[PDB]
Write a protein that binds this ligand. Sequence first.
Ligand SMILES: CCCCCCCCCCCCCCCCCC(=O)O[C@@H](COC(=O)CCCCCCCCCCCCCCC)COP(=O)(O)OCC[N+](C)(C)C
Ligand SMILES: CCCCCCCCCCCCCCCCCC(=O)O[C@@H](COC(=O)CCCCCCCCCCCCCCC)COP(=O)(O)OC[C@H](O)CO
Ligand SMILES: CCCCCCCCCCCCCCCCCC(=O)O[C@@H](COC(=O)CCCCCCCCCCCCCCC)COP(=O)(O)OC[C@H](O)CO
Ligand SMILES: COC1=C(OC)C(=O)C(C/C=C(\C)CC/C=C(/C)CC/C=C(\C)CC/C=C(\C)CC/C=C(\C)CC/C=C(\C)CCC=C(C)C)=C(C)C1=O
Ligand code: HEM
Ligand code: HEM
Ligand code: HEM
Ligand SMILES: COC1=C(OC)C(=O)C(C/C=C(\C)CC/C=C(/C)CC/C=C(\C)CC/C=C(\C)CCC=C(C)C)=C(C)C1=O
Ligand SMILES: COC1=C(OC)C(=O)C(C/C=C(\C)CC/C=C(\C)CC/C=C(\C)CC/C=C(/C)CCC=C(C)C)=C(C)C1=O
Lengths: 49, 49, 387, 69, 244, 55, 28, 64, 125, 57, 53, 53
Amino acid sequence: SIWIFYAPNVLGHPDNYIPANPMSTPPHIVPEWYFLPIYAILRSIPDKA
Amino acid sequence: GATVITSLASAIPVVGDTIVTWLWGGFSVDNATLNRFFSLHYLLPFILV
Amino acid sequence: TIRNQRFSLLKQPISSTLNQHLVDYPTPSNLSYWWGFGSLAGICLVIQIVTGVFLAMHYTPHVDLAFNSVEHIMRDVEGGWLLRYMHANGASMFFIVVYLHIFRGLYYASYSSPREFVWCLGVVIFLLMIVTAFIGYVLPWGQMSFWGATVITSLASAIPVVGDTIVTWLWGGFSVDNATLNRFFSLHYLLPFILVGASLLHLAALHQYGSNNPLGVHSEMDKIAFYPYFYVKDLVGWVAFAIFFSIWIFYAPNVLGHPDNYIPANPMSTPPHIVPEWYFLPIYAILRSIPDKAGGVAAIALVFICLLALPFFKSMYVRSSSFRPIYQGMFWLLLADCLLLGWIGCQPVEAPFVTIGQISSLVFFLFFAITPILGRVGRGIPNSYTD
Amino acid sequence: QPVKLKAVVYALSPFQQKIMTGLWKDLPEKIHHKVSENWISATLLVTPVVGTYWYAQYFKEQEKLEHRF
Amino acid sequence: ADEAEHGLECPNYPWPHEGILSSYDHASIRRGHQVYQQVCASCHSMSLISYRDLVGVAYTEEEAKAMAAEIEVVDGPNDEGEMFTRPGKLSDRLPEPYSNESAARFANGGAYPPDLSLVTKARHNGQNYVFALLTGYRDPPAGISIREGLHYNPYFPGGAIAMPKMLNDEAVEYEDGTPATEAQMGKDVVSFLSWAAEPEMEERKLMGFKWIFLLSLALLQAAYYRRLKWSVLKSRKLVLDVVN
Amino acid sequence: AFAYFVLSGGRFVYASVLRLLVLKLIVSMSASKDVLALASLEVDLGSIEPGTTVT
Amino acid sequence: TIDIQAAAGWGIAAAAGAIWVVQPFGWI
Amino acid sequence: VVDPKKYLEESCKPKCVKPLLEYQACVKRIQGDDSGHKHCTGQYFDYWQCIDKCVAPKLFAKLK
Amino acid sequence: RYLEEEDGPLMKTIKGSITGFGAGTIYGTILATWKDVPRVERNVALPGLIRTLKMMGTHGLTFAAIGGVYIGVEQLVQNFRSKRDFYNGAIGGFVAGASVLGYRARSIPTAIAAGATLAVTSALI
Amino acid sequence: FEGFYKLIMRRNSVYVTFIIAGAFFGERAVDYGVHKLWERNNVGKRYEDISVLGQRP
Amino acid sequence: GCIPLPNAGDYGGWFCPCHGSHYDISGRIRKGPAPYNLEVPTYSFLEENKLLI
Amino acid sequence: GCIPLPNAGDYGGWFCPCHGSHYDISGRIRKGPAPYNLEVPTYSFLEENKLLI
Ligand SMILES: CCCCCCCCCCCCCCCCCC(=O)O[C@@H](COC(=O)CCCCCCCCCCCCCCC)COP(=O)(O)OCC[N+](C)(C)C
Ligand SMILES: CCCCCCCCCCCCCCCCCC(=O)O[C@@H](COC(=O)CCCCCCCCCCCCCCC)COP(=O)(O)OC[C@H](O)CO
Ligand SMILES: CCCCCCCCCCCCCCCCCC(=O)O[C@@H](COC(=O)CCCCCCCCCCCCCCC)COP(=O)(O)OC[C@H](O)CO
Ligand SMILES: COC1=C(OC)C(=O)C(C/C=C(\C)CC/C=C(/C)CC/C=C(\C)CC/C=C(\C)CC/C=C(\C)CC/C=C(\C)CCC=C(C)C)=C(C)C1=O
Ligand code: HEM
Ligand code: HEM
Ligand code: HEM
Ligand SMILES: COC1=C(OC)C(=O)C(C/C=C(\C)CC/C=C(/C)CC/C=C(\C)CC/C=C(\C)CCC=C(C)C)=C(C)C1=O
Ligand SMILES: COC1=C(OC)C(=O)C(C/C=C(\C)CC/C=C(\C)CC/C=C(\C)CC/C=C(/C)CCC=C(C)C)=C(C)C1=O
């Protein structure tokens, strides 16, 4: 209830309130916080594969 | 975010690009991707149950 | 025996539940092909779910796009025509198979004790199937879809005080519009899963006591394992059903349907002939046989009330129609009456069909009124027919 | 509850028997049996449907003729 | 009233695409499409058909490309922010005669010429109905009068249609020299419309024949399998103590 | 041996049917014809000042 | 020395099944 | 040239003499007005249902 | 030469079954009257009438079967194939003869003979 | 059939491979035969039989 | 909720195809399950040919 | 598949904001995870101020 009623959008990013633009790209493209550790382990290796 | 995770299949050398374009339903993230995501997103929670 | 070592993998805890419910489950050796239709209905449900999941990848639930999205499924996505014809005629196959199933149950008195709960769960399943198929038929947003949705949501207005508020709550507005279509889409994705759960409960209730048989007698002395005997029998049934379904899909994909639904929904003009799918026609006929709103809705509810009250009638102790000549004849009259109600539902509401529909509805209810009398009287048969 | 049975059953291996010829063996007797046992059932199913259909077509034809100038 | 309300029933015509192994007549499809674009298209839309759909069915790719190039398609907005015009391409849908349904009604005395993309599937006995309607303009029965702006057609429900008779003799000219009588153009345009409503028909019938034959073989095998597994039970000899 | 030979014939058809249905679902997810019809075109452009980039 | 032969047989089966589902004749 | 459907319609008439005569009798019986409500739609329909049934099997043979 | 009818394949089959039961009842009546009565039935009347009526019913049944199946298969051949010739009707004659007369005769030899005969007759038509 | 049994049915892996091969080859053969029947039944009606194909002005 | 077809019925008024409801020329129900007559909305004229609903 | 940022990165070219791929003036990858340089389409000059793709 605290999250719902008093901090509804602090868990997300403001960038998803902008309609999708395939031309431009946000300078800070992040996933939800619960995928962050996986995404860090992905970015660290310097080879795509 | 849809553009990256659907490109993860491109790490496969032989069929990677084929898998990327099959998951997209086209040559880019577009309406087909959204529609198939929505269908998968209704179905997956019952498999989770 | 002491289970120190591992025997058959089938008897290990990984597999034991599946083994005892699916491979080794004791089954009466004299089951006919009329016991194949439950597994057929199960396969129809899986077919509907698979095709509908793949079709939902390309369908847009919006009044400005739904008709066009169907047409795009038919014309643009590869194998789309197949997926659509399979879902649309698989609904019909599902209803054919379930009707054959219900009539096997009525002929062998499979509803009787101790299988009353099986029959009640089946009735609930039939209600779920009807709702699912109807809201699915709304999704193409043709003329048939719009006008059928109009009348079925209007049915709630039969309630005097709160009927209008229920109708407007179901619509999401003062008319059938985009809100109706969008909520009908969500319900259509959801209800199939509840159908799967209800079917599992149905099966568990049936395995409490095991299946009834064509003689209607106690069968514990001659039971055999489901696998492989009834596996291969149901496989014969599965292949025959596949041939039937393929004939419908590839050569007559639109015969079980009305061309009106190929016209986009026009809220201004009702088509001159407005009927549901064939599998709803008997209920349509019973509805229209009452010259009264509330009377018609009450008759529709009384149909399912009678179906639910059937297992609890004090009856004779003989199940199978094979030994009940009067009930057997009444069975073949009820089957004719139901076929007549279906045919009448397809006719315009005018003479002579109003009288025929009224008499047919009366006969349909007379079946359920007369069966308890038959049971009470036939209780005295063993004392009157002496050796 | 298990049943207590006394019986002797003899069985032949499936690979020692003809599998399909029994389908077309004494066919006329099979037809005899299906017709003889089922003719009342078949009458009760078919007669109401065909009679009602025929009466409806007859009514429609006479009504159409009555409204013709 | 009684019979005019439903209309006259259409006959059954022996269409070349009828039969479990019968295809469309593709030359007849091409003739029907020329009839469409020369007579029908001025009032009826075919919003479901693209120029690419004709490729490999009735036209070569270059033929359909030139066809599309002949038409003017709106596009944009440009970098300056204005709608402009460009030649049509293979991916464009067939052009609409009117801007909206209200314009169509205003141009046709209040009646809306329906889209013909699915018309053969959108009427009972569709192909026969369309052929009978197109070739079925004639004088009304004695004592029946038709208001101005309508034309008698017994096939149309009610008998009074807003369409004037359009399949008049030699109303088109055929590229193969086929004499363009009213019946010939009727049959050709119905062939084209039937292809438009069901373009997957030939693939569907081939699939159907193949898989029904294979499934019949599978059914024979399934019967043998079931009876093989059940023979040990069905041929068993059972001895029991009981008599009566 | 005859039985095993006869059963293999229907076991051909079952394998073919399963393959067909799965591949029909997989390929229904692939790019549609309207999507493939829009995969080739040309566009002209002009000039920009040095040191800048236009997308 | 039969598990190796079983592995080879099942490997041949798996290869045959692969070429049969995907049918890569236009790619080879 | 000449449309085969009309020619076939005229050549099929000897098979439809009874409905044709009945339609003609109806026309004669309503040549008087009676407030413009009488008509011969049903007889017209019977005659043309016979003619169309006769013509349909033979039309497409003369067409290409 | 043939434009006096209203047709209807279902009506054709039903009316053929009725004419065949007409003609089989008469034929059975004639057959029953031609034969003698068994010696053990000379002094009793009822069983002779019963046997005559049974022969009537049996022959009506079989002749109705031929007269229905013939036209039914004939129309089911000229509808799906959509052609008019003596080939449609020869197939019907053959199937009617084979099926019914071999069910009654209990002999595959005789069925193929009866079907052959019934075709040559419909063919000569 | 006992000679064919000693080559195909002695091991389930060979039997399974034989089933995979039968599906492949039999489906191809049936497809070819069905297409032959289709072509023989529709002579002159194909797109490739359009007299004026390529000749639209 | 269906739309009754005009010039149809047993009373020269309207006919609803859905369940057979007959309305007379005034819109009054005369035959069928419908319990009410067709609803008259508020309306008025302006001079002779402008009707405001 | 992300789109690199112009005039960003430590090579004067393009920096990808997704996983930190760095491209130089010639659109060549220098550091990060991306394996290949920026794809070169088919372009030409019909005149001094007219390109075409
Ligand atoms: C390259 C080698 C061949 C590869 C194919 C192997 C599989 C072939 C398929 C089987 C073909 C032979 C089918 C049986 C022939 C025998 C016909 C027969 O007589 O009927 C049998 C029963 O057989 C059947 O029931 C027929 C089942 C056939 C199954 C259908 C075969 C499917 C063909 C597959 C072809 C591939 C195309 C499909 C690809 C997807 C009678 O059995 P009984 O009653 O027990 O004995 C009677 C006594 N007496 C011998 C004296 C007559
Ligand atoms: C009992 C076996 C197992 C169960 C299978 C059931 C089979 C019994 C029949 C069940 C009823 C079938 C459906 C009933 C209505 C179908 C008829 C109909 O609705 O009309 C359609 C027509 O119906 C048919 O065409 C029937 C097709 C049947 C398939 C026959 C092809 C067989 C292919 C393989 C040969 C099999 C040989 C096996 C040998 C071992 C549409 O006609 P159309 O004019 O609109 O289109 C023309 C075109 O020809 C149709 O696409
Ligand atoms: C959908 C509801 C319909 C409503 C119908 C309106 C009310 C009617 C209710 C009665 C049902 C109508 C059908 C009843 C007759 C069925 C036909 C019949 O039973 O005839 C048998 C003939 O024997 C009889 O049963 C006649 C009995 C007449 C009734 C006598 C009543 C006293 C018995 C009361 C017992 C009550 C409980 C009985 C339970 C069975 C059949 O003989 P068979 O099949 O064994 O063999 C002969 C045939 O040639 C070969 O198959
Ligand atoms: C900057 O960049 C990045 C982001 O941007 C902002 C991110 O947001 C994230 C975070 C995201 C994640 C951690 C998710 C990563 C993992 C997975 C697997 C995602 C999920 C991927 C999918 C969408 C898979 C979806 C699945 C399918 C398409 C299945 C398709 C097939 C289906 C439905 C059925 C298959 C068909 C058959 C078998 C045929 C028969 C079928 C029957 C049922 C009968 C990362 C890492 C990132 O770097
Ligand atoms: C979760 C499973 C299901 C999904 C996702 C689903 C999805 C869909 C979709 C997207 C449509 C619209 C496309 C179309 O018209 O073809 C549709 C239509 C339909 N569905 Fe379903 N469905 C499911 C299960 C079922 C079941 C179980 C039934 C039958 C009880 C059913 C009956 C129908 C019907 C009758 C239509 C209308 C078909 C037509 O005329 O086109 N569906 N469904
Ligand atoms: C999705 C729909 C359904 C499914 C999947 C299903 C499934 C099954 C299965 C697998 C069986 C056991 C095998 C058989 O008897 O065929 C069965 C039996 C039974 N079913 Fe259902 N069923 C469905 C609907 C219904 C309905 C609608 C009813 C009745 C209103 C019903 C009543 C019964 C009864 C009484 C039995 C016991 C049969 C006997 O023992 O003879 N079922 N069902
Ligand atoms: C060969 C050329 C044409 C064909 C094949 C064709 C086809 C059709 C069809 C199938 C209908 C539907 C009838 C029904 O609802 O049952 C129709 C109606 C109509 N057509 Fe066309 N059409 C053609 C040309 C035209 C032209 C040139 C016009 C106008 C000048 C026109 C105006 C209309 C109108 C107004 C309707 C609706 C009439 C009504 O509902 O009363 N059509 N047409
Ligand atoms: C001409 O007329 C007619 C039609 O037209 C063509 C028809 O088709 C039918 C066919 C309809 C039948 C047989 C019955 C349909 C029955 C039901 C119960 C459907 C009603 C359910 C609906 C609309 C959706 C249910 C909504 C829910 C659960 C709301 C969700 C809310 C929450 C989760 C809180 C009939 C009778 C008819 O006469
Ligand atoms: C002796 O017992 C047996 C019977 O005689 C009584 C049978 O009639 C049947 C056939 C019965 C069934 C399963 C049909 C019932 C219908 C259902 C539940 C349709 C829904 C199907 C699904 C999704 C299966 C649900 C089960 C699970 C665990 C989900 C995971 C599985 C899948 C994704 C498929 C079988 C197999 C059987 O042996």
